Amino acid sequence: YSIIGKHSVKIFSMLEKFGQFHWFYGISIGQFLSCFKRVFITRVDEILWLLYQEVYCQFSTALDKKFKMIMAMTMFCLYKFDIESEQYKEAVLTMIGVLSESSDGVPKLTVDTNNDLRYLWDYVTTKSYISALNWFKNEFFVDEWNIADVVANSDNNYFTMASERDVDGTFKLIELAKASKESLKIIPLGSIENLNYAQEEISKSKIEGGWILLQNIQMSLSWVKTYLHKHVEETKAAEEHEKFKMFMTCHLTGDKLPAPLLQRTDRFVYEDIPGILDTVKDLWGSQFFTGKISGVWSVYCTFLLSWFHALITARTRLVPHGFSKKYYFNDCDFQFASVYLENVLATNSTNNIPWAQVRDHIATIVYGGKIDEEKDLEVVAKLCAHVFCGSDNLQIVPGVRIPQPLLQQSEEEERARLTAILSNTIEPADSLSSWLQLPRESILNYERLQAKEVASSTEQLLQEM
Amino acid sequence: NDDLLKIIGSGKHHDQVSKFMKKMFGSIESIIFLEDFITGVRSVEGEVLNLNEKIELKDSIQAQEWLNILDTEIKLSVFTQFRDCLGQIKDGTDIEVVVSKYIFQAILLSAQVMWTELVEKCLQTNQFSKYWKEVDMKIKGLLDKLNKSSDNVKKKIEALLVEYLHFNNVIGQLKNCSTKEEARLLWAKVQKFYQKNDTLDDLNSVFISQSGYLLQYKFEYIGIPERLIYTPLLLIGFATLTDSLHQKYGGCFFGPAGTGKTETVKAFGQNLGRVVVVFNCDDSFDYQVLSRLLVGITQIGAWGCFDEFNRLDEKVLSAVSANIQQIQNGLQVGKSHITLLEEETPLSPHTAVFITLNPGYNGRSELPENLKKSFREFSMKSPQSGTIAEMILQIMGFEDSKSLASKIVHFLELLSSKCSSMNHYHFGLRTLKGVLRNCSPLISEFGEGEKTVVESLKRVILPSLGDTDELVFKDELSKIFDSAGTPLNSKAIVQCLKDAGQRSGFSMSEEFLKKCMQFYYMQKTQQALILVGKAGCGKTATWKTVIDAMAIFDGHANVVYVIDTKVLTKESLYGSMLKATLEWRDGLFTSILRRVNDDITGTFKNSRIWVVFDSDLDPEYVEAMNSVLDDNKILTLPNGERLPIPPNFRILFETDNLDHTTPATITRCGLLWFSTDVCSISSKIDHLLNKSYEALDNKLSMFELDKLKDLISDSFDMASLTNIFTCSNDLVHILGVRTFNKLETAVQLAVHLISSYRQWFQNLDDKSLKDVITLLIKRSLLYALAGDSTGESQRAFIQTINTYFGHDSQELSDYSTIVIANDKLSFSSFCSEIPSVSLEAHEVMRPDIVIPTIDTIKHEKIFYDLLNSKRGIILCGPPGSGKTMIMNNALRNSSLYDVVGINFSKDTTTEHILSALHRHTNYVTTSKGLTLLPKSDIKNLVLFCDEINLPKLDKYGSQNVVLFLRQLMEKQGFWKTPENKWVTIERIHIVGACNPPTDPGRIPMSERFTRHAAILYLGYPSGKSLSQIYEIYYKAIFKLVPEFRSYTEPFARASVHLYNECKARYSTGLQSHYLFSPRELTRLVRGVYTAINTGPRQTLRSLIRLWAYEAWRIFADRLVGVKEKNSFEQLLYETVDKYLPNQDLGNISSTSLLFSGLLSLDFKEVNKTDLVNFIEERFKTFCDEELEVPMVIHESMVDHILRIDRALKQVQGHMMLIGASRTGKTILTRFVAWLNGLKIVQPKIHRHSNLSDFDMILKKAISDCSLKESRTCLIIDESNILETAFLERMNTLLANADIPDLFQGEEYDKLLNNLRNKTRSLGLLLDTEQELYDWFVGEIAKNLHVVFTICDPTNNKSSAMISSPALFNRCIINWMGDWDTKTMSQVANNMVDVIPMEFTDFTIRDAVVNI
Amino acid sequence: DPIISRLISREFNHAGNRVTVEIGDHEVDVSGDFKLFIHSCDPSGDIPIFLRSRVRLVHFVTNKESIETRIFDITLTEEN
Ligand SMILES: Nc1ncnc2c1ncn2[C@@H]1O[C@H](COP(=O)(O)OP(=O)(O)OP(=O)(O)O)[C@@H](O)[C@H]1O
């Protein structure tokens, strides 16, 4: 058991160190024990491996894709370094060293000796990075939990999912509730009315047993430390109360939540990123709920914007090679651009040529407002050049051509026609280089960097213990 | 509340309210009455607005009621004056007519509306060219009207110029467009001011379009504010602000400070007829005031801007941020009433909130999450320069403003790409704003041309370039634009400059004339000047020379104030306000302004005032006066004023580096970079010689002087010295100073040595005379180049000198001396003659005792020669090398000079210097120098500052205490820190000692200070002179045991061998406290004497053991571990065997030789068993009488008790114990003190102890030691030293025998009085004030005993104790750091002395202890 | 603070019935019924070397090493 015991500390020490780095990455000793208890319900060897599997399956969910992968690589080195040969240890460390830029050399080749490990070197040598990074997860042979699975296993009434500003799992939670156990109640924390209504709907829902969500807690935080800190601590009767589940939404990049509260509540990182085309379809999708307020020609501009926004946001992710730094573009930025679009049609003639100042205003005030680096400001602009000026056929992306309103001038026809152009397109394999004008070479450079980050942080973590 | 109450109270009067309006309006300053009626109002700017209806005022009227009518009429009055004017210009009336009768706000709005409408139609026709010239004419028309204008209306024309230039600029851009589409894009981005001639509600009739969006002009008065020059970037800010506001979103711009984000919010308000309220956030700003202000804004429907929102405290910021959301959420929805600060207040929908966000330490600050969805963030950027250049050129009087702006930018841009990367180089727009600002006065001389641009370029750009880049300038200036061949003011200034220098001593070199010219041309335009260069560049010469040359050329007198910036505190210099009585006291920089501003009783109006800051300049100091450096030209008090500075009043800055200062500070001022020293090596010496000759003229006849100057001229030529100064560099220089700055040291010495033998020059042979000169010149030239050298280097340099001087001329020897008869004339040069010293047994240790050597006399002579020159001396060298002794003995011998020792520590204040001096110096108001600080007696005073490279430096890194001495050496007096005037010190000299700056603890000193010093490196001597020296020391003490007179030399040789070995075996490579010096030898020599003078008749076996014990206590007590401790046991053995071969020795280990005077009446070797038993009978007693503490008496402890005993017995007893923890170092000290009959003082310090408290604890123990004759033992622990100052006080108590600060002023007089009481009581009168304090000090030195207990010397705080030289040198260091295995077993045995246990297998007790 | 210091080191000034201790200045009577304990929260904060040596340092912290001990109890409940 000492042999089991020694491993579990270095495991917990690793999970602990993630909490030092980032606030949301806490782990408690009881979390670790509850996890280790699960492992039961050469025997010592199997139980050990049952731990490393179980630890991966439970604590993976509460980390982001980077930390998922650092935990995988580290855990693999914590296990296979002790168990496997010293021949093994330097071969895998030499490979982690190529993935980081620490060193580059070729490991021990032994025919039939190691094939799993011979298969990794193939990934690293083929310069295929993301696959090499995942190899450490796969090597654990675990069926990796969905937020859903987590929720089903969990019997806690509280949950906090942090997420990057790129997304909001608000809509994941909607389909999670609808598919089983219904009872979805979205509560925005805005002003005093919202907080005031909020705390009312909280106390009532727990007795009723409905699901509740507290959208974007970070913003309302001063209140959290006063009301929620007391309230969630007091509510050990919430365990006694009807099957009910409360959810809270954070942002990782942003104001730091209290650790005690955070540890009480289950944790997930919504890491789930939509396609360019899918976001086009999600954007265009809602715009029909308005009714009909604007003319046929506008619908075209609104479709254009739907593409534009879905292209800049996709480009946001890929830095450095893409934008210089991480910029976040919102639904608010879409709204202000559409507002100006309705207005430029309301103030101008139905001649198509108003297009020049549509570019400038969208690229320098509406979206270029936040942008501070001149390098990036030209990117926004060159994209407006492409999305906004164009005659009759645009070809926003290589597959798809966007044709200008027809003489028939039907707005219901045009919706159907522009929805049809979306349904016909299939977003290619290489979308991030083919659709966002940027070259493939740059995409790989990005892939290489995120590899480098996981491999570095693991080297560092191994030496530290 | 306060101001509100005054208004309601003052209602009867009405007139009193005008003061408060300025606050609740922002635009207006005071209200105008006929008393019955309000005729109008005036703005803070000066502009007079008259109302349409003058409001009548009566007893039965409320302030509420009358003021509310005023607000309404004031806006209506604006519409009136607007339509009145707009209609006029519609009927083609010239703008010059309108200006005189319409308020700016009204005429501005009218121009905008008419312009916009005239350009709107011009887009249809495309008749741009014809409207353009038309406007261009109005531009010139307004420009010439400005020159003929009353200053108040001069603001109005200038403000309108901002606008009319913008007008023509837009039309011009429109003229240029490729197509009509291109023109209609450009036009959409502009702010278009329209009118409704269709509907009523006239205050709602004027509206503004931009980017497709409209914004209704609210009518509110703005006055005539200085209008922001229109840039594309400006319009874009205006464009975002309108796009945010249209959707009911708040505007927010983040960016670097100095981008004018608030200026923009201000401007954008004004353009729409609003006075935007700016909340400067976090400037001691209450939340309750802002919560007030917020409600006021939501009711009045005003515009609020949070100027640098980021700088608010988390508590405040949450509260504010939450409030703002309510408002922005209320507007977005349009809720009539919204709740904020838990009150239902109504919200005007005219309301808007703006947040400027300056960057923090990380980068650009952020909005709280709630505000992110409520505001719209924008990135302010500095404007591309080209655009601002053109406009600024256009306002001043254009010529071709388009091409000058191209050309200026290209040039500045080209400089950046072509010049070297230098730290102080700025070719940023700040620089072109400066070149442009410099242009205005320059136009007055020449034209509104490129040639005036050209001259401004070379006025600002050139003085800051360094020689390589100085041609890059000339090459690209002529490449871009070639303007003029010759300069005006070429002859007239120059002759006024040369005549000033001939009088000053100076030589007109290519460079000195250049840098003199560059300066002259700068003072003209620039009010603040910066002079940067290598220390001794000639900067104080250039400016003092130009300044002087202007009183000859203009005829205007100068009044110069040189202030060392960093010697004084910001409070001492700018203005200090005192906590409780909040009394405003002047300071230094503000008080000298009051002579010019407050009381120009004499001529200050016709005079020029110049305020020079010699010292290194830092942000904190320049920031406190940034307002004078601003366009303001006014000084801002911390509380209670702005004081205006005239154009007479110039600020200079001379410094050596700029690394600390801000590019912002530079570009307000004019920078004069001194690339090289102004003048030739020869030319410096030339001036220097003549300056030296002048000193002598007041103590030497013309016949003597004429003849001595004839000698100097023919003895040394430049060709010789050239190679000597070249070779000076090929040498290793400790405390290095550059060759050029060595010259004052040379010539001053040379002149003094020659003027010394002046009587012997009357009759002496003309061949022989030359040789006397040449020898002294060769000598003085040696110490001035090679004095700070190894002397191993000096010897080699002596030949280098001989080489390059003429071959026949008298050669220099290592110990060369000149010899002359006392009463009868003789000549010849013979060397190295030494007196023989006899001193008795008691004389062996004496604070004033030096054994003359080949080197002692050599050093004492040169050191003394420098004082006669009156040059500052810096003695550098390792500890124990004799800097202190050589200095002290050369001066304790002479009647001329009188010495005062100041011992410097890590943190010494400049007042410490002054307090120490106040006993020996006397202020007298003699007319010769106003206040003077001469010495309190008639003959010269010498301040010896020991450890001058020890005091620390500002966070920027500048040691003020050093700069204070630099002030004394260069300026000759100093500014009084409290009373605030100049005191010129009379006949006081600076001499300092310091360790090499490669040594740890040591701080590097400023070449600006060390340039004034002759530097002498003194090392250790021989290992063979040391042996000679201490032989005479043993000789003296062996007058007590004459039977061993044979044995004095082998004892002296042994002592030195042990020294040599300890120093080599145990160095600072093993432990930091392994630091040995001849001080230890002198401690050993005396330590032997003391045992003899109070011991039984000594056998040869006794004496060697007596010597061995002292050798142990002086060299090995400090040694750590056992490997080194055993090493010394064998070393001691090894040394006796080589020098004193005997068979009578015993075990020489410290444990076996125990010497004490506790049992014996004499200091004798005692028995191990006799001592242990004596301690045991005394420890019971000490246990019972004092603190009850059980301990085991063991072998080590007895040895240690004797260590402390000898320490506490010596007259000056300082011992520091290093004991880890639990060793009992603190208990043993208390015990040995109690045995010796010493009062045990242990500072009762605690968490809540101030310095004053510890000051008290010290002061008492000091006063009880002299006035009560206490014989106290002061135990200071590492815990006791709470601040750094505590330890600094402890130093002063050791290095000197008193703390001067404790007893100063009145507390000095009280002590002085009490002292005379006790002095008389004991039976002596002491005549002088100095004679009494010298007893007081001498009493402390023999009654006060400081014992230090530090546990881990590895700790950084306990490191500082050991580090401190004062403590380390004047203490006996002892090591108790670990328990020995033998002492562990010994202690364990006595503890298991009680026997519960019974026989066992195996001893039973012996086994348990071993586990 | 330094003053408690004599109370920590067992130093006292004896009388027939009364036992006195010096704190700051005032000499106060020690009961015998009197007990002293010192409490701290953070091992990050360093206590002075004088105290640390006379004081009985005890760590009431649930450590990482706590997991080692607690996993064997959990393993053996599910193993034997
Ligand atoms: N034209 C000249 N001919 C001869 N000597 C000159 C000339 N100009 C300057 N010097 C020498 O240079 C020195 C000028 O000292 P000054 O105080 O101007 O230098 P500094 O850089 O201000 O030094 P610090 O910065 O230490 O005050 C004078 O002592 C003088 O001997």
Ligand SMILES: Nc1ncnc2c1ncn2[C@@H]1O[C@H](COP(=O)(O)OP(=O)(O)O)[C@@H](O)[C@H]1O
């Ligand atoms: N030539 C000498 N004559 C007399 N004493 C000397 C001589 N050389 C060294 N010493 C001894 O060394 C000590 C000199 O130390 P000091 O000059 O104070 O050190 P430093 O000047 O390096 O601070 C004196 O106590 C003195 O006894």
Ligand SMILES: Nc1ncnc2c1ncn2[C@@H]1O[C@H](COP(=O)(O)OP(=O)(O)O)[C@@H](O)[C@H]1O
């Ligand atoms: N010789 C000894 N016999 C018994 N106890 C000792 C001895 N030396 C030190 N101690 C113990 O170690 C502690 C140190 O006492 P102290 O004299 O203050 O030394 P320090 O100043 O190093 O703490 C005491 O509390 C004492 O109990």
Ligand SMILES: [Mg+2]
């Ligand atoms: Mg000077």
